[PDB]
Amino acid sequence: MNKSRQKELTRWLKQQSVISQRWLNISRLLGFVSGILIIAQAWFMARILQHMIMENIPREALLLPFTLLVLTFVLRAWVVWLRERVGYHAGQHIRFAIRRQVLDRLQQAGPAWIQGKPAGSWATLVLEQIDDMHDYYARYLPQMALAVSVPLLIVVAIFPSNWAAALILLGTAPLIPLFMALVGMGAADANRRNFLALARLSGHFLDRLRGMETLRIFGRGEAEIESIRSASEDFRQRTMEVLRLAFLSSGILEFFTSLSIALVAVYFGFSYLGELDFGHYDTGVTLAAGFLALILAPEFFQPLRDLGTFYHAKAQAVGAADSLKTFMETPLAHPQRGEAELALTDPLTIEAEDLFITSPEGKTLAGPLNFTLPAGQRAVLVGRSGSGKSSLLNALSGFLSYQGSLRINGIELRDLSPESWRKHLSWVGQNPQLPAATLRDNVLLARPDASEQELQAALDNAWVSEFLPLLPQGVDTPVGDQAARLSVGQAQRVAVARALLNPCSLLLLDEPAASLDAHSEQRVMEALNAASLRQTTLMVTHQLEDLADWDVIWVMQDGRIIEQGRYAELSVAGGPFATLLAHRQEEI
């Protein structure tokens, strides 16, 4: 709010710039050399013109003071090029470091936190709100270095000749800061509000553009197009109440520059007419000093003019810094690291008592739990939708923190090493994802090398055995981005093959049967039962068919287990499971 946020944003931007100190110092030194070269060029040009305008000297007799001017021009061009390149490198390094930090934090956050935005906010954040930092740093900071350095050098250079021309330039320098800041400014955080409103107007336009379908049905449009016009009028009228004040600084600076130039010209012009006597230093005012004063006067204020051009670069970076600081300071929870490991050849028995599961930000998600899973058994966790069914799966997978005891063959779960625990799992997702290129790679993701018989007898008549003479290539066909070409079920038969390829000890399923055709569902559940017959399995599903084979059925209501038992004992007792099966039967 107001200044209290602008100041801390600027402070954070300044603080996150200690990774290119050498480059910044090099740029400052190069700026110093541009000063000596401007003063050399001016002295040499004045020297040539006082010999050519007075005390007539043949043109072909000034070759010695003529080549040095060309050398100075060449050196200045070289220095400008070097400054540009150094500034770019200094800008790039900070972006590299910041992107690395952001990606590391996102990786450490976990999958639970990531699936909160529609997969576009993160990329927009990273790219768009990270490039502005380089723009700001590289274009702005060397200019701030130059603006204080060059004028003092010019003042020092001019002083030995005349002490009045130097005092003319000195007089203005206090005035512009004080006048500018006090009367003609004081609304600099108010422009942040205008920029935010301008961005929010584009956001509202985007929201309207997404709703074009729901406006066509109700006959709107011509009656809605007035809203955009009214909002734009309001924004313009609100904006032009502060631009009548923020533009006074340019007028003040131009007025001071013109006043300085005019005063220098008038004083030196009337000096030679025998009407003034201030600073001839007991020798006499010569034209070679007047031309030097006239030439160096524009170079005094030129660094300050460029600062006005770079305002849009700084104001754009603050918007990105706001979101970056908001993201990087959010307090999270994270799971607890583990140290212990266990043997690779033993069944896993899971037990718990008074266990709670917490979201990465806060709030309890699964209430109190009480169960016990014998080794080698198959358990199904059915229940009402929106009851936090898919929370025990994430708790076991190590994506969420928890309170209480969760024991994997005696040992707790906060003590297990992830790199030795995740090797015992195998996951089947509700929404498939293919983070590879070739369809063979999306199958061998578990082990990126194998023989030539597992790709034959992987699963069943699935997309690995059948569904081959339908694609215009073999098993190495490049899938593409997010399996765009494979639309039927989003390939819920390659994920199952990937899970079935590697022999595992605890198979977790998360509604694998969603969005498939009848034959595909039949084959998927056949393969799933064949897989679950071999080891301990924990399945969360909504289909209520062929449940007679499952050992124990859990019903989850409001995060609390209510009834546990076999299908025969639980389809008659009249509990919540009876209501669920009755509703499913009333569906048809």
Binding site: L209, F218, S250, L273
Partner: protein
Amino acid sequence: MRALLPYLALYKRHKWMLSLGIVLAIVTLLASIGLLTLSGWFLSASAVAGVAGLYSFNYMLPAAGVRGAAITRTAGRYFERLVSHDATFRVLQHLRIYTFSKLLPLSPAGLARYRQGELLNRVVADVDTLDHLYLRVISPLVGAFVVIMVVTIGLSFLDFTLAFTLGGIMLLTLFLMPPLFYRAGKSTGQNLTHLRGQYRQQLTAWLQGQAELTIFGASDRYRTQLENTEIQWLEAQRRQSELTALSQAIMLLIGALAVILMLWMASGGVGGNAQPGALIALFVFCALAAFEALAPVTGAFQHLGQVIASAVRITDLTDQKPEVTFPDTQTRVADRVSLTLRDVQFTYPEQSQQALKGISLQVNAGEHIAILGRTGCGKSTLLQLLTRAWDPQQGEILLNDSPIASLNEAALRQTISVVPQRVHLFSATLRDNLLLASPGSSDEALSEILRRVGLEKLLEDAGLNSWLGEGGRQLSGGELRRLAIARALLHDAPLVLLDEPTEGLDATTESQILELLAEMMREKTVLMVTHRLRGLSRFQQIIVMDNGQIIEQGTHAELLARQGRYYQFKQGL
């Protein structure tokens, strides 16, 4: 430049403001140049006149110049800034209005040829690049050209040779260079765009797959690929910056060349005077001041490529042309309407072999008919066709025995109420989000509509006013259906086309919704599409269709007498 013509023709509305901005910029530059030139000439002339010249040197006249130059420069700078920032906003508003107006008509049969997401953001970014186009491109080029022409003629009034050499130098600098810096720029821009697209794709894939890439140990071999792509992208950016420095270097060198040429040429008889005197400073100072004014042109060439790409993208998106037309001949509506289909064989222009082969049904006034079937049989196609989104490939459709073609936008959109599958909540107040259906209802009408069956928890809140959507409150499907139905009820129409009204719900909410829909509309003709046959016994005509055709039709009691059509003898799911 061809793509910019249809959008350079959009400035014919506001021309006075742009002309004023250009004139003010030109005036400011001319005032600065004149001030510096006058100061230099006065200094040289006063110095060469000497002490014995005070009675032959009228210095009163050259003071008005050095006063007016300063005053004019200051006022011109200030008002030029103000006027430019006004014109930019006006142009932006006009552009947004035009884009929305030209994008509205082609909503259903349009934007479906691409992926709807990540298109609108591109459109917004393109509009921003276009306003940047206007300012950053239009202003400096015209300003510099006019300033150069004026300076050249003013100097030519004295002596032609030096003036035209200076004019040629400036003209060759302005015209030749930007085309010559527009080839490697194009190449590097293409490479950078390709690399950025690849990096974004890989980042999105990694972020989405982080759920499985951790359980199956893989999320270490993809961060490396991301880093390598980032390295290549940074290499391309560096190759572009190394080119962009050369422009400034060459500009400074050209200014030095011009100044040196002036100094050497004006030393030997400028104007026809072997010992000119007090005029050498004139040309040198004029050249210095003029060449320290061409900075805006140097950076103008960077904005051209992005602007051209954005303009051509918007133009291509806009010229996609509509699909159906409206015979806007005026008509009226009636309180009793009916639906009569006889035969439709419709397929999408994209691909072929879809549903709706020979569908035929007749609906009388004030009759409740429910269409049954599986998913994808063609019910949604019928609903989308009935609102004239697409056009019937071959067949006839009649409302009140009148063809559906001869209807205005207002009449068709008013006489038919639709409850869509997906409900969109605008980022505004509850009052604004709900007054879309009927913009004449008072607060009491809204209050009683809410106090009817539906949402009553939002009634108290902080009041009617609130924030709904991303900014504020969030609703669920059970809280969305009873608001969509409220909107439909407020938009009073004799025919109501309800889409799937119960999917993704629970038992009690579904029963309450069914009671609401049976009671609140007992005269309006209703033709809803369902696939959960709960409560489907109060309808007098049930139609069950599959594989894009009608298998059998009849009343519940009569059609249940020939074995379970979907019940499968009352046994199934």
